[PDB]
Amino acid sequence: PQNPNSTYRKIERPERHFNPLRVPKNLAAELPFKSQIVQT
Amino acid sequence: EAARLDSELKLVGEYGLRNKREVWRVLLTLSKIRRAARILLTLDEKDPKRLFEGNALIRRLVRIGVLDESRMKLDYVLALKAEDFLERRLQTLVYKLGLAKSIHHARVLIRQRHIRVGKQIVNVPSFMVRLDSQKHIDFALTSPFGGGRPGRVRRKKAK
Amino acid sequence: AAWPKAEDPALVQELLDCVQQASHYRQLKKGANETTKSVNRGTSELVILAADTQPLSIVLHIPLICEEKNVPYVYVPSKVALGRACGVSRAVIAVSLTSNEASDLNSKIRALRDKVERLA
Amino acid sequence: GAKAGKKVIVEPHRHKGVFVARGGKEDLLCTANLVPGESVYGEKRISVETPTKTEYRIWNPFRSKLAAGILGGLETIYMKPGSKVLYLGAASGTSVSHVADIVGPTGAVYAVEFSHRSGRDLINMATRRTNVIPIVEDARKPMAYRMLVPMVDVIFADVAQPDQARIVGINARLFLKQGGGLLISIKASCIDSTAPPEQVFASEVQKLREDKFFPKEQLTLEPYERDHAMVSCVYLQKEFEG
Amino acid sequence: TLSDWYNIPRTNLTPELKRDLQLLRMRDVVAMGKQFFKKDNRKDFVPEYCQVGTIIAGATDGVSGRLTRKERKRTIVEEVLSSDSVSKYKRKYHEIQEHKKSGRKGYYKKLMAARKR
Amino acid sequence: RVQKHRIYIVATNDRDLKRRIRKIPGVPIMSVQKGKYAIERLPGA
Amino acid sequence: PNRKKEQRNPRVKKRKKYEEKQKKLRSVKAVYKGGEGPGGYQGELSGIKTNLVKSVKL
Amino acid sequence: MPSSMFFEHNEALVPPYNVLVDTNFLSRTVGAKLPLLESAMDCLYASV
Amino acid sequence: FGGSSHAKGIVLEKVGVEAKQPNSAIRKCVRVQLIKNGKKVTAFVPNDGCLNFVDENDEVLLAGFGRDIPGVRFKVVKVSGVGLLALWKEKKEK
Amino acid sequence: MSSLRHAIQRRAHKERAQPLERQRLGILEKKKDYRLRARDYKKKQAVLKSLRQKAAERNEDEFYFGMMSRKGPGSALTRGKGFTGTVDGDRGNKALSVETVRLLKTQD
RNA sequence: AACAAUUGGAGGGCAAGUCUGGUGCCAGCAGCCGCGGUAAUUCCCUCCAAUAGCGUAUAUU
């Protein structure tokens, strides 16, 4: 009288990483000089 | 406090003891002996009870080998500490006389009936061994280390 | 060359007795070569030599390294008395005796080289 | 560990004339060889040329109390290239060779020893080096070599005597400058064998202090020795060079 | 050149000497737990005055305390590369790489293929 | 002096100095409680 | 409350407690632990630090 | 860290005990009429 | 309550069994009829599990404290002769 | 109290994984992974909020002397397909003169 | 997994559980209680003290 989804299992969690900070083209184009995003 | 905890932990670690009760016991007997030496020092020299009584006390502590036989003065018997008594106890004489590999092995080899002291065999590791009786600490006769039968594991090994 | 000559009125006797007790506590390096190893390695707490050496040059070398390591040395006048003081059945010509952290033997070494310091 | 032929670079130490040789798995305190190509007592040493010439004798804290103090974390050692050092208790001239390597060609080490045999090895080493003088006399009689020693900057003291502060006392009252360096190795088992070593060290410091020195620091040499102290003090002033 | 340190010259800083200086600030990783060192975290590890020497000879040790012809190598880094535990370096390195590829981008790319399949 | 050598027993009574050298470890404080003396942190008698 | 096999014997518990507090005093202060051993001074193992002054001003 | 310390236990103090005396203590023992060497002697049981 | 050290009592009302917090002092305190004094004092049952053992009308021994309601002063030690901690552990029945 | 707590009253409670159908879809975020993507999104939107307040509250007639030694972000018309919103940086490459390239090609 | 050492205290971690507060995603107190499952499950502790002894209450010195 059992269910297989009901049993406790081991949970494997890789370390969560997220994508970097994605500023839009027009915002980064229209923001002033001391803060202008400098990407090579 | 903490000075007593590190002090008595140093005593229960230097010499292989089971609790702090034996430490307090040894400091109690040293308190009585050192007390008697103090109240003998209260009188002058040529007070004949300081001469004969203090002479008898330093002869008894030379005889049980706590006070070293070189120094013969009641100030030098005031200057004692509990590592002298624990250094004179039987367990530490088993280890310092090298019958045992460690001090806890020495207390095992005393509650275990493997050692004798002279004619007696001694179960108590708190036995205040006399300086004259220091040399005759050895293994007991029916033990596997003093001849005799080779004991349980080798009996079940031969069978 | 035996200018730290120990005196037969019981200073020799306390030296040889402490030799025997260190022999029973296994704190004892016997013979000139093993004495030399203990002094050069710096384990040595005190060192006795024997002035009854038939050429004494063969033990004259260790007062140098004992002066370098600053350990007290003293001569007893009989290598046979030193030899059965050790318990060897041969003649021990020069003996060195070390110490540990906690022993009444270490106390006896301390008082003994206090007397050797009263000589030198 | 420090095998013969391992590559090991040399950088200066914090002191004047003392060097430290860092290798892959170890480091080695070392001085500069005054007479190149010659080891004194059979020690490892380091050769390097300018970018034949440069040579660095490796210095042992087990055979030298002063190396035990420099690896023991001493503030100053008072000795520099150009100093005058009065070494007391100079057995065989080994640490006298390292002090002579510190004060260098323009310095002067005044080695004093009582024994004639260490006198002879001292005359061998002190015949090889020309800044060390050999003096074989009693350190308890400074008026024997008062014709030999001028006013020195530093006194190093390594004697195994019970009257060590008195010996260094009269030697400083004849030969040590106004505001002089003093660096004493102390063996508590040699002064008082039945007393605790901190109390022996503090009592010897007090005997220097009523002998009118000024103790700057004390350190105990105890990963390398047992019950040994190194006391660094300064004669008649609070600050060293005056 | 220092005038009171007996003319140790200034560091003729070459890329091999700079590798050796890096190895000397990194000797704790070299002896992989078997020997730990004085933690020396200064920012600029290159000193002002250095001089690359070799140990010559102890007059009591010549049997075991002496490098051989196939071991008197040219740099400290070549000595460390000559020694053992190089596969131990690579083993610990792939523990670290297997932990730094944990959930980064091949993981999420596998998730996208798993959903789209 | 006690901070330098740390051998001594300090015989004091004031809360200022007794509280000052309860901060540095392993020193005994001897006081006088009106009929006899007292020892704070010497683990002997 | 679930207790330990080391807590079962008080003598074993003070033995394992002294071994740890002998271990921690190695980390803090400097213990002698013998002079030069067999090999005879392979250098100052565990580094040399030049700025550090570990001494009591007096 | 000073010699002869085992985790806030000075093993370096052993009889004959040294004792720095303060002005507070000399005032309060001449006030408590309690002689100094004999009562330090009596509270430590050891030569000071 | 300074003449005797332990006082017997009747559990009168389990005060605040309808509370929400499982180990708050409201749920822990119990109204007690003191036998010899006749007063009604409330006392801290030290657990909600022990509160499941403290029943109505039962003879209950109480003691003091020593140091959510600072001011309730006594403490339930026994229920019907058996100690309440020995009831909390599985030592004894009642 | 902590002394008045049993050992079954300290049992860790077990987190439940996904059904085997959803095992394709991934990790069941429970509270930790939710807090990681929530704090990461809050940080991103906080930085974008500060940058929108920059671009809104910027001064059009501003002058810096780095504008005489930098090339600006341009527009979609001056940059075209190679338009990101950013300012390019220097790789350290340079147009190298003809004498020194003669030196480098005698070496080559 | 035994020939089966205790008595006190301090602290950490935990659910598709519960309860409460409130200008989302926070915080609180707390949790033997969770979807299934009881021949079902095999999962989480560290430190301090005394230690065949120890805790607690009042009188207290």
Closest chain G residue to the Cα of H6, Cα to Cα? G25
Which element (helix H / strand E) includes I86? helix I84-88
C-alpha C108/C-alpha C113 separation (Å) is 9
Among D196, D197, D192, D191, smallest CA distance to D168 is for: D191
Most D-contacting residue of C43, C100, C109, C114 (CB-CB within 10 A), to test interface: C114
Is D110:D176 a contact under the CB 8 Å cutoff?
no
Where does chain H have alpha helices with state H?
A: 23-31, 36-44
In angstroms, how far is CA B33 from the centroid of its own chain?
Answer: 15
The first and second tokens of residue E28, run together, are 């704790």
Q: Identify the burial level of B44 via C-beta atoms within 10 angstroms of its C-beta, where 0-12 means exposed, 13-18 middle and 19 or more buried.
A: exposed
Is G52:D215 a contact under the CB 8 Å cutoff?
no
Is the CA virtual torsion J46, J47, J50, J55 positive or negative?
Answer: negative
Instruction: Determine contact: D47 vs chain E, CB below 8 A.
Output: yes
Chain F residues 1-40 within an 8 A CB cutoff of chain D: 4-7
Integer distance in angstroms from CA B91 to C1' K53?
25
Rg of chain D in Å (alpha carbons): 18
Quick one: which residue's CA is nearest to K14's C1'?
J12
The 10 Å CB-count burial string (b at 16+, else e) for D101-133 is bbbbeebbbbbbbbbebbbebbeebbeebebbb
* C-alpha distances in Å from residue B70, one per residue of C11, C108, I71: 13, 10, 68
How many other CB atoms sit within 10 Å of the CB of residue D210?
A: 9
Q: Which nucleotides of K are covered by protein (CB under 7 A)?
A: 5-16, 19-20, 25-26, 29-38, 40-46, 48-52, 56-60
Instruction: Determine contact: E45 vs chain G, CB below 8 A.
Output: no
C-alpha B13/C-alpha D148 separation (Å) is 56
Chains B and I touch (3+ CB pairs under 8 A): no
How many other CB atoms sit within 10 Å of the CB of residue D84?
A: 22
C-alpha B134/C-alpha B94 separation (Å) is 10
C-alpha D49/C-alpha E51 separation (Å) is 8
Q: Identify the burial level of C37 via C-beta atoms within 10 angstroms of its C-beta, where 0-12 means exposed, 13-18 middle and 19 or more buried.
A: middle
Among D53, D42, D48, D46, smallest CA distance to D29 is for: D46
Among D175, D164, D156, smallest CA distance to D211 is for: D164
Rg of chain A in Å (alpha carbons): 23
Place of tokens 């560990």: D1
Place of tokens 């030899």: C83
Chains H and C touch (3+ CB pairs under 8 A): no
C-alpha D207/C-alpha D199 separation (Å) is 12
Is C16:C76 a contact under the CB 8 Å cutoff?
yes
Which element (helix H / strand E) includes D199? helix D197-209
Question: Chains with ≥3 Cβ pairs under 8 A against C?
Answer: B, D, G
Q: Which parts of I1-94 are beta strand (E)? A: 7-13, 29-34, 40-44, 59-63, 74-76, 78-79, 82-83
Among B42, B64, B65, B66, smallest CA distance to B54 is for: B42
* C-alpha distances in Å from residue D147, one per residue of D111, D151, D177: 14, 11, 16
C-alpha C44/C-alpha C119 separation (Å) is 19
Q: Identify the burial level of B102 via C-beta atoms within 10 angstroms of its C-beta, where 0-12 means exposed, 13-18 middle and 19 or more buried.
A: exposed
Q: Which parts of B11-147 are beta strand (E)? A: 115-117, 120-121, 137-139
Q: Cβ D1–G47 below 8 Å, yes or no? A: no
Integer distance in angstroms from CA G5 to C1' K4?
11
Is F39:F29 a contact under the CB 8 Å cutoff?
yes
C-alpha D28/C-alpha A3 separation (Å) is 69
Residues with Cβ < 8 Å from E18, sequence gap 6 or more?
A: E46
Is I42:I29 a contact under the CB 8 Å cutoff?
yes
How close I37 gets to chain J, by Cα (Å)? Answer: 31
C-alpha I45/C-alpha I19 separation (Å) is 15
Q: Phi then psi for F39, rounded to 5 degrees?
A: -120, 130
Q: Which parts of chain D are beta strand (E)? A: 7-12, 18-22, 27-32, 45-48, 54-58, 84-88, 108-113, 132-136, 152-157, 176-187, 215-220, 228-235
Instruction: Determine contact: H3 vs chain F, CB below 8 A.
Output: no
Phi-psi region of G34 (alpha: psi -120 to 50; beta: other; left: phi over 0): left
Is D164:D171 a contact under the CB 8 Å cutoff?
no
How close D66 gets to chain E, by Cα (Å)? Answer: 18
C-alpha J40/C-alpha B110 separation (Å) is 67
> C-D interface: how many C-beta pairs under 8 angstroms?
41
Experimental technique used? Answer: cryo-EM
Integer distance in angstroms from CA G11 to C1' K51?
10
In angstroms, how far is CA C2 from the centroid of its own chain?
Answer: 14
C-alpha I75/C-alpha F15 separation (Å) is 38
Q: Identify the burial level of G26 via C-beta atoms within 10 angstroms of its C-beta, where 0-12 means exposed, 13-18 middle and 19 or more buried.
A: exposed
Is I13:I45 a contact under the CB 8 Å cutoff?
no
Q: Cα torsion at I23, I24, I26, I29 (round to 10°)?
A: 50
Among I38, I84, I43, I33, smallest CA distance to I64 is for: I43
Residues with Cβ < 8 Å from J87, sequence gap 6 or more?
A: A36, A37, A38, A39, J70, J71, J72, J73
Helix (H, G, I), strand (E, B) or coil at B153: helix
First to last CA, chain C: 14
Among F10, B89, D23, I3, smallest CA distance to E54 is for: D23
What resolution, expressed in A, was reported for this entry? Answer: 3.2
Among B37, B95, B67, smallest CA distance to D194 is for: B67
Helices H36-44, H23-31: crossing angle, 10 deg rounding: 100
The first and second tokens of residue B16, run together, are 């292989």
Could you tell me which residues of chain E have a Cβ less than 8 Å from any Cβ in chain A?
Answer: 99, 102-104, 107
In angstroms, how far is CA J97 from the centroid of its own chain?
Answer: 38
C-alpha I61/C-alpha E56 separation (Å) is 87
The first and second tokens of residue F21, run together, are 């050298």
Pairing of strands D152-157, F29-32: unpaired
Residues in J closer than 8 angstroms to E115, CB to CB, are: 24-25
C-alpha H14/C-alpha B137 separation (Å) is 31
Total residues belonging to chain H: 48
Which element (helix H / strand E) includes E25? helix E15-25
Instruction: Determine contact: H8 vs chain F, CB below 8 A.
Output: yes
How many other CB atoms sit within 10 Å of the CB of residue B42?
A: 11
The first and second tokens of residue D104, run together, are 């260098």
Residues with Cβ < 8 Å from D104, sequence gap 6 or more?
A: D17, D32, D34, D81, D82, D131, E6
Let me know the angle formed at the C-alpha of J76 by J72 and J79, rounded to the nearest 5 degrees.
55
Bridge partners (DSSP) of residue I43 are I30, I74
The first and second tokens of residue I50, run together, are 């022990």
Integer distance in angstroms from CA C50 to C1' K27?
86
Chain J residues 10-29 within an 8 A CB cutoff of chain E: 24-26
Q: Omega into H16 within 30° of 0, i.e. cis?
A: yes
Q: Identify the burial level of D154 via C-beta atoms within 10 angstroms of its C-beta, where 0-12 means exposed, 13-18 middle and 19 or more buried.
A: buried
How close F2 gets to chain G, by Cα (Å)? Answer: 11
Pairing of strands C44-50, C73-76: parallel
Helices C62-69, D116-128: crossing angle, 10 deg rounding: 80
The first and second tokens of residue H43, run together, are 């509270």
Helix (H, G, I), strand (E, B) or coil at D89: coil
* Nearest residue, CB atoms, C103 vs list B68, B70, B96: B96
Bridge partners (DSSP) of residue F31 are F38
Instruction: Determine contact: E37 vs chain G, CB below 8 A.
Output: yes
C-alpha B72/C-alpha B59 separation (Å) is 9
Q: Cβ F32–H46 below 8 Å, yes or no? A: no
Helix (H, G, I), strand (E, B) or coil at E32: coil
C-alpha D98/C-alpha D111 separation (Å) is 12
Q: Determine the residue type at C34.
A: E
Q: Determine the residue type at A31.
A: L
Question: Chains with ≥3 Cβ pairs under 8 A against E?
Answer: A, D, G, J
C-alpha I85/C-alpha I72 separation (Å) is 20
Place of tokens 């090991």: D8
C-alpha I39/C-alpha I28 separation (Å) is 20
Among D152, D191, D200, smallest CA distance to D173 is for: D152
First to last CA, chain F: 25
C-alpha F5/C-alpha J105 separation (Å) is 74
Helices C32-40, C62-69: crossing angle, 10 deg rounding: 20
Q: Phi then psi for E7, rounded to 5 degrees?
A: 65, 55
C-alpha J106/C-alpha D22 separation (Å) is 42
Q: Cβ B18–G10 below 8 Å, yes or no? A: yes
First to last CA, chain E: 70
C-alpha F27/C-alpha H5 separation (Å) is 11
* C-alpha distances in Å from residue E40, one per residue of A26, D75, D184, G44: 48, 19, 30, 15
Which element (helix H / strand E) includes D175? helix D164-175
C-alpha C96/C-alpha C116 separation (Å) is 14
C-alpha H41/C-alpha B74 separation (Å) is 14
How many other CB atoms sit within 10 Å of the CB of residue B61?
A: 21
Where does chain C have alpha helices with state H?
A: 11-24, 32-40, 62-69, 79-86, 104-119
